[PDB]
Amino acid sequence: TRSSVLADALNAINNAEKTGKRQVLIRPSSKVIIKFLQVMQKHGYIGEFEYIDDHRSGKIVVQLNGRLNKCGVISPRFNVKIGDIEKWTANLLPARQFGYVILTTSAGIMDHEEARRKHVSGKILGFVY
Amino acid sequence: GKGKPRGLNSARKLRVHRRNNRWAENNYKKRLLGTAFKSSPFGGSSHAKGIVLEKLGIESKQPNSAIRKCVRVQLIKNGKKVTAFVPNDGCLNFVDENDEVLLAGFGRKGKAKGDIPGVRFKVVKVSGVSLLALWKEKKEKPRS
Amino acid sequence: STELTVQSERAFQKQPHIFNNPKVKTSKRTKRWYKNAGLGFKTPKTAIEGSYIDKKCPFTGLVSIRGKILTGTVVSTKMHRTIVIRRAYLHYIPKYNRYEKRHKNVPVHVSPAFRVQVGDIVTVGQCRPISKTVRFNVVKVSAAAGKANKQFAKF
Amino acid sequence: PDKQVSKLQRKNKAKQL
Amino acid sequence: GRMHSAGKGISSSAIPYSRNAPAWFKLSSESVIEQIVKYARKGLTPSQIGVLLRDAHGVTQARVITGNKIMRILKSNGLAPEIPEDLYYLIKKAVSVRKHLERNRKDKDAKFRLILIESRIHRLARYYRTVAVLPPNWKYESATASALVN
Amino acid sequence: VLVQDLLHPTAASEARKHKLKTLVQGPRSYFLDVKCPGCLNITTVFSHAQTAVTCESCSTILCTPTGGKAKLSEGTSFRRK
RNA sequence: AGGGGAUCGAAGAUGAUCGUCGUAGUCUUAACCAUAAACUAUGCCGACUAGGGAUCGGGUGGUGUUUUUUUAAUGACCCACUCGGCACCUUACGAGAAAUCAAAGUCUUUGGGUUCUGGGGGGAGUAUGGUCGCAAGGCUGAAACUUAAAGGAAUUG
RNA sequence: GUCGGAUUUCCAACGGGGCCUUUCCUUCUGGCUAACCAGGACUUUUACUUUGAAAAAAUUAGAGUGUUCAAAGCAGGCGUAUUGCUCGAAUAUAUUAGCAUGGAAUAAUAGAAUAGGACG
RNA sequence: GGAUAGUGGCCUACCAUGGUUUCAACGGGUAACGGGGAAUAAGGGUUCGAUUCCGGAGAGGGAGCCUGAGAAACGGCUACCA
């Protein structure tokens, strides 16, 4: 029962961030993991990463630079209104002025600080600070 | 997965687990059993009032071994018979048998002021004349 | 079932105040009164052309359709000329921040213009209170039975 | 032996008190 | 893993990365399709057939060489049986266990294992009676499985 | 540790891994071309048989199954292809 | 309820400052009963993060040794590697109240999925009601009441 | 270039919308040679979320206002107060359910295997 | 079909065998009139709401009815019970 694949990815990236491995191998990556790691890559949290192709799973090796503290995942993925990202960026980021609660909209996977600007909101996914 | 089910459509089992586990506290059992209205001789009230049956005295718990001078009240609104403490020293001479005392509990939800084995209510007012003021000699107590 | 030779009760079923003329025998040789119920629900071809009566049908009968238009998935249809749909949905609890499933068993009148089998995704419309529990009426059937006719001819 | 003695509405019948 | 036991084992077939190609392989589909209908008229099961073509002749996965899996070939050529292969073997096992349990009733262990086997039959049947590769209201049955297998 | 390619492991190190647990999984089993002794019809036999592979030319045993690789027989020289 | 009934042997005999017999039983066919310190006192799935050698089961290499008709395969070894299993051992990276733990870790940097249970101690696994059992009893299981502690780990003369 | 400010641009960052790349973004109908509404099938249905309408007053948040202050109240300010003028009683929240409207990734569901399947 | 101001098992006649349910029916309890609200103020909640507004229900207990547009009216009537 791998239930949430993104949860296993982010777990592995924590466990091999704490212990200073500069690269990891996650499995069995999907679109959502690519989008999430693009969001983390965009604000400079992790380095370049790379999708291998077997015909089935799609493992990924992520080179990670070590700027990451913690990447999380919020199971279950709750529905979050625009009024709510106040209450999510106050539970689970360390300060007001960094970190990103990322969340899934219909406009596409995105951190909250852009989600205010395009002014949509959907479900939540994890969090990176 | 930390016990409880965190699933997004699993609210029912959350609130039904909770309702099963609220019958674990004391106070929530008190409310919904209606224990304040069945037992507990003040029938869900702060105070009550009653007729003094007789004046007694104690031989309480160790180390404080003494005779502490309680009384016997029969309440009016129930016919229950509950023992009662008279406050500040003296004041057993203020009450008599067959007088009208107003009771209230000690402040523990029942049990004790201290060593006292099974006395839970203090007397606030005899004959409507307010033991604080009698003990401080501010009013007087007519008989009956 | 109802089984056309429709006149099977102790009275004469009819479209009321719709008059065949016995003296004038002309090119019709059949007269019914159908109405489009509205809201772009197509009246069926079995309504206009069949011989049933159904005073509570929304196409031949006196009742009319307004108010709520609901859908549902049909469950037991043992009653005569009426069915029960199951109108399921998610409830929300704000405490626990999650949801729960809930269902309603709405009973609902069906015309014999529709062939409703158990496990159809039906669409109902609100009628006038047509029995004790019935308030609704079937307006469109969109049955998806997984091609169970030829289900025995398989790999 | 029989000691249910619970869940009663005739409580109102304690108006006889 | 291991639906009924406490085992964990990983034991399998790493199908390769190519989709066409052996690239050393002989002529064509008509040869292998002809082989498949040959064995199917002989009366084998698609598991056995993929095995027998694997080792005897030179084929890899038939999907690579042909355009279709084995089961689709015996479907298209009209020899795909009424029950699929696996549920057939399960009912077969339950019949064997059942007969052994008829003889030796004081046994507890084959009772327990039979109760596992029938569980697996129920799970597959309930998979098959959704996708209608069995007709619905077909139920595995404990008295007349012996006629149901044959 | 701390740092290494997972993308380009040395194939010496990658030979020892279980077939699944490589970077991209693959089989380790080869096909081979058996030359029957008394005849000419060369047969291609998968290295893990499960069956007594009949030589078709002369109807005889080529290789016997075991738990593992297909145990061959008398001096039928085989080519790994 | 039979059948068997050797040993041992609940209950039943004998002795100044425990021993001898011994039915019920243990044994078995057919029924019940559903308890245990039924205890690795540690739910079940799933992923990831440290080494060590040990062996168990299978498998892949070693012109590695023996052994056989030292000729071949085998068989037993020896070495390497890998998959699954039972465990040890070592750090303390983390965890913890601590003892300790590769998991009791990745849980205030507080969300992989799910089942059950507890919410100070006695009153009490009692009372009552069902419910199952031929019975013994099992399951479920309060309250009034009383109490300021009851309990865990570890150090010290 | 007004001298606390934009007007022209530079330059990126932010947002949108089309257009082209194999990329349907409905066929059919008069106002017409689709800009427009009426007019036929539906283009599975959902869940979610943005926006809008609905969301009695009072209470709550809160704008203005020297009730002598404050709680309050919705009043009041302003001239020759000599025949008057005049400002204002905002705004916001208001779960969920219904309704209308975006968005189309997340989570589901159907679309062609006995082809009784579409363009014929 | 009756009845109603009017749809309707609302009621009668005939016919059929259904309708709700562990997504918790039904039954029990409520020292339960329902809301708008109130108390407690990190967030999330918990506890209360007889009580100024809206809505229902009752006028000792049940029942019936007159009159009227509107009453099952009680600062109207009739009977029975207390």
Tab-separated table of N, CA, C and O (backbone and C1' of nucleotides) in Angstrom, chain C residues 67-70 87 89-90, chain H residues 46-48 51-55 95-100:
chain	number	residue	atom	x	y	z
C	67	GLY	N	-40.000	23.989	-9.833
C	67	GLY	CA	-39.300	23.782	-8.569
C	67	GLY	C	-37.973	23.117	-8.753
C	67	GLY	O	-37.195	23.474	-9.648
C	68	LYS	N	-37.670	22.170	-7.876
C	68	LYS	CA	-36.362	21.541	-7.871
C	68	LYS	C	-36.319	20.477	-8.919
C	68	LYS	O	-37.271	19.740	-9.110
C	69	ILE	N	-35.180	20.430	-9.621
C	69	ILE	CA	-34.852	19.367	-10.514
C	69	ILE	C	-33.638	18.653	-9.972
C	69	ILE	O	-32.568	19.229	-9.820
C	70	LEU	N	-33.834	17.373	-9.677
C	70	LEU	CA	-32.836	16.575	-9.000
C	70	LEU	C	-32.492	15.366	-9.793
C	70	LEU	O	-33.252	14.960	-10.681
C	87	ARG	N	-30.449	9.476	-3.177
C	87	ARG	CA	-29.978	10.801	-3.459
C	87	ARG	C	-28.789	11.029	-2.473
C	87	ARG	O	-28.936	11.577	-1.356
C	89	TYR	N	-24.813	12.057	-1.124
C	89	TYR	CA	-24.155	13.339	-1.029
C	89	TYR	C	-23.248	13.385	0.177
C	89	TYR	O	-23.404	12.575	1.099
C	90	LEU	N	-22.307	14.326	0.148
C	90	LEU	CA	-21.375	14.506	1.226
C	90	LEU	C	-21.795	15.578	2.114
C	90	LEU	O	-22.089	16.677	1.663
H	46	U	P	-24.041	17.233	-12.659
H	46	U	O5'	-23.300	17.471	-11.279
H	46	U	C5'	-21.874	17.502	-11.234
H	46	U	C4'	-21.396	16.378	-10.353
H	46	U	C3'	-20.590	16.817	-9.148
H	46	U	O3'	-21.379	17.321	-8.098
H	46	U	C1'	-19.444	15.039	-10.215
H	47	A	P	-21.008	18.767	-7.463
H	47	A	O5'	-19.791	18.421	-6.504
H	47	A	C5'	-19.839	17.329	-5.572
H	47	A	C4'	-18.448	16.939	-5.125
H	47	A	C3'	-17.564	18.082	-4.677
H	47	A	O3'	-17.870	18.508	-3.371
H	47	A	C1'	-16.328	16.638	-6.086
H	48	C	P	-17.976	20.051	-3.085
H	48	C	O5'	-16.528	20.593	-3.414
H	48	C	C5'	-15.429	20.271	-2.562
H	48	C	C4'	-14.137	20.709	-3.156
H	48	C	C3'	-13.938	22.207	-3.281
H	48	C	O3'	-13.511	22.806	-2.080
H	48	C	C1'	-13.317	21.182	-5.299
H	51	U	P	-13.456	35.272	-4.032
H	51	U	O5'	-14.396	35.832	-5.206
H	51	U	C5'	-13.929	36.801	-6.174
H	51	U	C4'	-14.972	37.023	-7.246
H	51	U	C3'	-16.342	37.411	-6.729
H	51	U	O3'	-16.428	38.806	-6.473
H	51	U	C1'	-16.572	35.674	-8.316
H	52	G	P	-17.376	39.327	-5.291
H	52	G	O5'	-18.872	39.100	-5.861
H	52	G	C5'	-19.275	39.867	-6.981
H	52	G	C4'	-20.561	39.377	-7.584
H	52	G	C3'	-21.749	39.349	-6.654
H	52	G	O3'	-22.332	40.629	-6.483
H	52	G	C1'	-21.712	37.375	-7.912
H	53	A	P	-23.086	40.966	-5.157
H	53	A	O5'	-24.475	40.185	-5.295
H	53	A	C5'	-25.458	40.673	-6.204
H	53	A	C4'	-26.636	39.746	-6.274
H	53	A	C3'	-27.324	39.391	-4.960
H	53	A	O3'	-28.204	40.371	-4.447
H	53	A	C1'	-26.947	37.425	-6.171
H	54	A	P	-28.241	40.595	-2.849
H	54	A	O5'	-29.082	39.361	-2.270
H	54	A	C5'	-30.404	39.034	-2.709
H	54	A	C4'	-30.702	37.623	-2.292
H	54	A	C3'	-30.614	37.384	-0.784
H	54	A	O3'	-31.857	37.617	-0.134
H	54	A	C1'	-29.250	35.832	-1.863
H	55	A	P	-32.011	38.868	0.823
H	55	A	O5'	-30.516	39.105	1.300
H	55	A	C5'	-30.197	39.021	2.680
H	55	A	C4'	-29.963	37.583	3.092
H	55	A	C3'	-29.293	37.429	4.452
H	55	A	O3'	-30.147	37.677	5.561
H	55	A	C1'	-28.163	36.089	2.893
H	95	U	P	-22.409	32.241	5.783
H	95	U	O5'	-21.497	30.956	6.019
H	95	U	C5'	-20.116	31.089	6.379
H	95	U	C4'	-19.664	29.850	7.104
H	95	U	C3'	-19.993	28.554	6.389
H	95	U	O3'	-19.039	28.189	5.399
H	95	U	C1'	-20.744	28.403	8.630
H	96	U	P	-19.530	27.836	3.892
H	96	U	O5'	-20.592	26.674	4.081
H	96	U	C5'	-20.145	25.381	4.445
H	96	U	C4'	-21.303	24.553	4.933
H	96	U	C3'	-22.385	24.275	3.917
H	96	U	O3'	-22.079	23.205	3.072
H	96	U	C1'	-23.388	24.970	5.923
H	97	A	P	-22.453	23.284	1.536
H	97	A	O5'	-24.028	23.375	1.544
H	97	A	C5'	-24.790	22.216	1.844
H	97	A	C4'	-26.255	22.472	1.627
H	97	A	C3'	-26.653	23.033	0.285
H	97	A	O3'	-26.732	22.013	-0.696
H	97	A	C1'	-27.763	24.200	2.005
H	98	G	P	-26.247	22.344	-2.178
H	98	G	O5'	-27.295	23.416	-2.710
H	98	G	C5'	-28.626	22.935	-2.964
H	98	G	C4'	-29.585	24.078	-3.157
H	98	G	C3'	-29.395	24.879	-4.410
H	98	G	O3'	-29.911	24.193	-5.534
H	98	G	C1'	-29.754	26.329	-2.601
H	99	C	P	-28.977	23.999	-6.788
H	99	C	O5'	-28.847	25.479	-7.384
H	99	C	C5'	-30.051	26.157	-7.778
H	99	C	C4'	-29.828	27.628	-7.992
H	99	C	C3'	-28.735	27.983	-8.958
H	99	C	O3'	-29.110	27.732	-10.306
H	99	C	C1'	-28.773	29.501	-7.162
H	100	A	P	-28.027	27.197	-11.329
H	100	A	O5'	-27.293	28.526	-11.763
H	100	A	C5'	-27.997	29.555	-12.428
H	100	A	C4'	-27.153	30.773	-12.463
H	100	A	C3'	-25.759	30.606	-13.054
H	100	A	O3'	-25.734	30.711	-14.457
H	100	A	C1'	-25.647	31.867	-11.067
